[PDB]
Structure formats: structure tokens, C-alpha cells
Amino acid sequence: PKHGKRYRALLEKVDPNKIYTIDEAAHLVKELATAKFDETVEVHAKLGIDPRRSDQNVRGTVSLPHGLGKQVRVLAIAKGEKIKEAEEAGADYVGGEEIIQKILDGWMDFDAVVATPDVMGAVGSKLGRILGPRGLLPNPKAGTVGFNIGEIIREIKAGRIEFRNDKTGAIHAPVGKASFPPEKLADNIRAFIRALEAHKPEGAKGTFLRSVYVTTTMGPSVRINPHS
Template sequence: MPKRGKRYRAILEKVDLQKLYSIEEAAALIPQIKSARFDETVEIHVRLGIDAKKSDQNVRSTVALPHGTGRAVRVLAIAKGEKIAEAQAAGADIAAGEEIIQEILEGRSDFDAVVATPDVMGAVGSKLGRILGPKGLLPNPKAGTVGFNIGEIVREIKAGRIEFRNDKTGVVHAPVGKASFTPEQIAENVRAFLKAVEGAKPESAKGTYLRSVYLSTTMGPSIKVNPASLHKA
């Protein structure tokens, strides 16, 4: 096990590793455990009571965080005709037709999210699936990134809507803010996120669904959160 630095050990002393913190208590600790000179991302990690090997138990959905993630998201919108202008007016950083597919095939990657209208998904899926798929950027109706209401989709993503899905071990990871956020903002984002994960529970999942919840900053220690505090005032 690598030896931790003096600063990290001092921060770690502020966290009771045996305690289950409420959402509000954990959020209040965030300003005390940040250690980097940059504005660290606040991350949430949720272990779910699912069998990730079964397709009917996989969890995938979206949530609009009340206070956003604190990160500027560059949105690429691929559409046709007037929908290109609609996406641009809604704030898309790049709004283009199918011609941009070739640019992406040639290496263009100046975007963090990709949305599309249904009438271009045939070309987008067949030509960009192997490039965008592994990065989690391929537009998908289940993720809310495909639709003719492309202006609305762009606005929601720019405002802080994020997609989440479980990994192969049944854990969901996501950003829920920045260390510079107030504890109240972090707590509200965490509550919104957990409610969305809870609402995405597969019908076939049995037993305890929210097994464990941890909050952490990019460079800081983890804080164990009591899942039951989600339903407490």
C-alpha cells in the first residue's frame, strides 16, 4: 500500500471511517477534505444490489442536477435542416449535419457530449459507433440524447443534466458538483442523484438496492454516506 503524504493524512483525520454520515453531514465535510489547488470535482459512488451480468438488471438513466456539475460541457449536435439552427440557438457548441461524421472519423474530438435527431442516427450509429461507443458518447434514446426536441435536449445538458449507468461490478460513478459548491448545493445535488438512481431500479432486482454510497473529492478521501438518509428530513 503506497504511503500517504502528511497533508493527506491530516485531511483523513477529519473523516471517521467507521461512521455512516447523513447526506448533509457528508456534504458539510467536503470543504474540509479538499486538498488540491484546483477546484476538485465532488464524486459519488453507489454500489447497487443488482446482477450486472444480467441485461434486465442494468441501470441507465439521466438526472438534471439542481446546481449542475460545475463543469462547462461542450455539446455537439448532429441534425438536419432547421434542427441544426434550433440546436445552435439552444447553446450547442457545435451544430452540424452528417458532414461532421467524416471530421470525427478523422480525429475531431472537441466535444464532451453528443446529441442527435432520430433521422441521422442511422449514419451516426453505423459510422461512429466504434469511436463514440467506448467513450460513452454515442447518442442513445435511453440516455435522452436522441430526439427531435434537440433544442430542449441541448439546454438540459448545458444546464447540468448528466447520464449515469452501472459498471460491470454494479457500481454507479458520477460527478455531483465541485468542491467550491456550498454544502447545501452539494447535498441537494446528491439527493437528486440518489432519487434518480432509486427511480431507475430494475423490476428484477431483489433485496437491498442502494448497498453503499460514498462521496469524495478528486484528491480526497471517501466519506461513507448512509443511504437511509435519503428519506430523512
């Protein structure tokens, strides 16, 4: 009845009988873990879909407002003014079909690719073969193609957090900082509640949001009732 984790104390904080609710969560998590540096809490969950038959495979992104600087890099592929807008907006990788060519060669440092409709052909067909089933090629309703290279990369820097059910039907995303206001963690938990809810493919039949919770990096793990 004794286990291998010093976290044990934090675990004692952890009383897994209730699934509680969001704001409560902000507070008890914020308290629960501030180990090395300050907790990097995150929320994770699983939906009653079936990602094999991609007719439910979701992803996208809500806009949990709150300053940013880390996670999921992206390539702003376009030309002059777009390099301007998106680069400044908040880009990790920037350029155009020249960057596309560099990638075809041996340079790929971006998980998501967002290109404006001006170098989109070169991006998708030149780099189509390269970014491929990696998730690195631009798609017109996958928050990856369009002129607002600046707007989207911008949010990438000011606050982004995306969605993408993994193999077994679950998503992960940042919806509040560690020492961050409880009500805050609540609100972001929410924006995610919503965009996620929307993504909810019409291919669901019943208890869709099955398990919805807040867990940290290295720390506690408790479900939250995004209802209250």
C-alpha cells in the same frame, strides 16, 4: 501505522466509523478538501445488479440543477434549426450527418451522441459501425436520440451529470461543488438519489443501493445515508 499521504491531516478529519448522511457530507467534505484550486468532490456508489446480463445495465441522467461548463462531451447530430437549438443549449460537438461522415473518417471527440430524428438514420447506421460498443452511438431511451437536441445539450451546459454502472455495478456523478452551499450539495446528492433510484432495474433482489457515498477527486471518501 504511519502512511504515504500528506492528505493524512484530511484523513484525520476522516473518521471512518459512521456512514453519516448527505448535508453533513456537504459540510465535512467542503471543509475536508480545498487543495490546489477548489475541490471537485463527487459521489460514487454500487448496486446489487449484474451488468453482464444487460437486463439491469442502467444509465440516463437526473437533472441536478446548478450552472455548468465541464465533463462528458456530446455530439448534436441533426440539421439547421436543431444545430441552432442544441448547439446554443450547451453543445461541445455540433453538426449533422456531415459530422457523422467526418467521424466515419477520423474525427470523434464526443463521449455521448444525441441526434434529432432528422439525421438519426445517418447517425445510427453510418456511425453505428464507428461509435459502436464505445458508447458513442444514439439510442431512443439512452438520452441520445430525439428532437429536443436543444433541451438535452442545453442541460449538458446548465447542469447535467449522467449515470452508467461500470463493469462491476457502480456509478459516479457530480452532486455538489467544493465551496458550494452545504444544503446545495445535499439537494444535488438528492436529485441523483432519485434519478438513480428510478434507473434501478427491476432485476434487483434485496439490498440494491449497497454502498452510496460522497468522496472527492483527490481527497476524503465517506459513505452517506441518503435517507437523512
